[PDB]
Amino acid sequence: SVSVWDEEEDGATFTVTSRQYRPLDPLAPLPPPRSSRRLRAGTLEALVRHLLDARTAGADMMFTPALLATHRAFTSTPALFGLVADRLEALESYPPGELERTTGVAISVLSTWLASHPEDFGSEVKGQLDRLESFLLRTGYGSADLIRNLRARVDPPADPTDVLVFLADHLAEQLTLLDAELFLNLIPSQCLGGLWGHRDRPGHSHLCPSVRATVTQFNKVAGAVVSSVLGATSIGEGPREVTVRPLRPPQRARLLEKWIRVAEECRLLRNFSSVYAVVSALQSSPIHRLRAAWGETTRDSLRVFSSLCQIFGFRGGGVVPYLGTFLKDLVMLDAASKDELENGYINFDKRRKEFAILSELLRLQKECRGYDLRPNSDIQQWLQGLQPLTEAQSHRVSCEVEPPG
């Protein structure tokens, strides 16, 4: 019925899971059992053997995409490419039949890799590319298609109170526009807890750029809300260097309502990144205090605000998730499971859990491409000229605006 048994090989460990399904005709012979030989652990070289095996496509369907997406966690791109060239050059002396079929798998694996993660192929792999290119001509072997594509990748002061001037849904569209294109630019392998977790380490300032870009925009929005509601513009690094607009509580309320509606419009656009930027910013400590202003706020705005806090035309069918839940999940996943087993074998089960999460943001990326958002250059230049307050600046202004009693 359902049978599971382990295996062991040169430098790897497998697990076969063959389930016998009942035939469609109850009196017919048993149909061939549906089986899946899945790699569980092994050396880096053994992983490349499994990678270049023609059987893997059907036996371990999701080994290839999982290795490719996660390899930067335990290796580098030129090494992985290098080992694939090692194997192929080793098979040169072999009988031509075994050479062709593997070359074929190698062609198929690299093309998938190229389509899935082009930003992997920099100038770092120039030698490995030559290695593969020499091979294909030497053995006489979409080869030409792959080489063409690989070579083309290896060888190439605004007023924050002016938010009231724009319609709220118009603002959400612009914010969604910016968040969405950053989410499309997101390289999901950079979200891995073994890379994002070490972003602060003494040599990783240029590591994980696409993820950081997402965070910087989340912080610019949360800054914009905080700075707007306080009616203050940051003119220096210091806690005192900032000009404040004098505003009565009823006037501040109008800024609260505006942003609450901006949040709500982001929710209808399914841009949760900015919903969470606006909401957490409204719940932020320098703006949470402002009771007078919060007391002057229309009650329907407060209900929408509650409804949003409890979560935490053709306006495009898309989504921008709050990355952070994902980053949390990946960071905790990196710390919960070990990189390597006691024998020094790479724990490939961890990567499988990792890739499953990386898969979900891949489908969200494809969903995100359904967005129909039109650029607004007036809102865009307003945002670009916006100078947000530091946490120290915002706390000082809040006290000067609504003093403690």
Partner 1 sequence: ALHKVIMVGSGGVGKSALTLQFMYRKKVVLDGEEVQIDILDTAGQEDYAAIRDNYFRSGEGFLCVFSITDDESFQATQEFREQILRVKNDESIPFLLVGNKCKVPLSECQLRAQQWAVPYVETSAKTRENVDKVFFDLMREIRSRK
Q: Which residues lie near partner 1 (CB under 8 A)?
A: 193, 196-202, 212, 215, 218-219, 222-223, 226, 276-277, 280-281, 283-286, 288, 312, 324, 326-332, 334-336, 391, 395
Question: For the CA atoms of 109, 115, 121, 126, what is the dihedral angle to 10 degrees?
Answer: 60
Q: Minimal distance in Å, beta carbon 329 to partner 1?
A: 8
Note the Cα 103 to chain centre separation in Å: 32
Q: What is the 3-state secondary structure (H, E, C) of 326-359?
A: HHHHHHHHHHHCCCECCCCCEEHHHHHHHHHHHH
Q: Minimal distance in Å, beta carbon 46 to partner 1?
A: 27
Pick from 43, 40, 110: which is nearest to 75 by CA?
43
Kindly tell me which of 40 and 289 has the beta carbon lying closer to partner 1: 289
Q: Going along 28-172, which residue ranges are E strands?
A: 37-42
As given in the structure block, the two tokens for residue 365 are 């990326």
Kindly tell me which of 56 and 273 has the beta carbon lying closer to partner 1: 273
d(CA 73, CA 189): 8
Kindly tell me which of 105 and 364 has the beta carbon lying closer to partner 1: 364
Rg of the Cα trace of the chain?
27
Q: Minimal distance in Å, beta carbon 167 to partner 1?
A: 24
Q: Minimal distance in Å, beta carbon 333 to partner 1?
A: 9
**What is each CA distance from 263 to 34, 159, 273, 281, 286, in whole angstroms?**
49, 20, 10, 11, 19
Q: Minimal distance in Å, beta carbon 234 to partner 1?
A: 14
Kindly tell me which of 1 and 306 has the beta carbon lying closer to partner 1: 306
Kindly tell me which of 151 and 220 has the beta carbon lying closer to partner 1: 220
**347: phi then psi, degrees, rounded to nearest 5:** -70, 90
Q: Minimal distance in Å, beta carbon 281 to partner 1?
A: 5
Kindly tell me which of 201 and 299 has the beta carbon lying closer to partner 1: 201
Pairing relationship of beta strands 232-234 and 2-8 according to DSSP bridges: unpaired
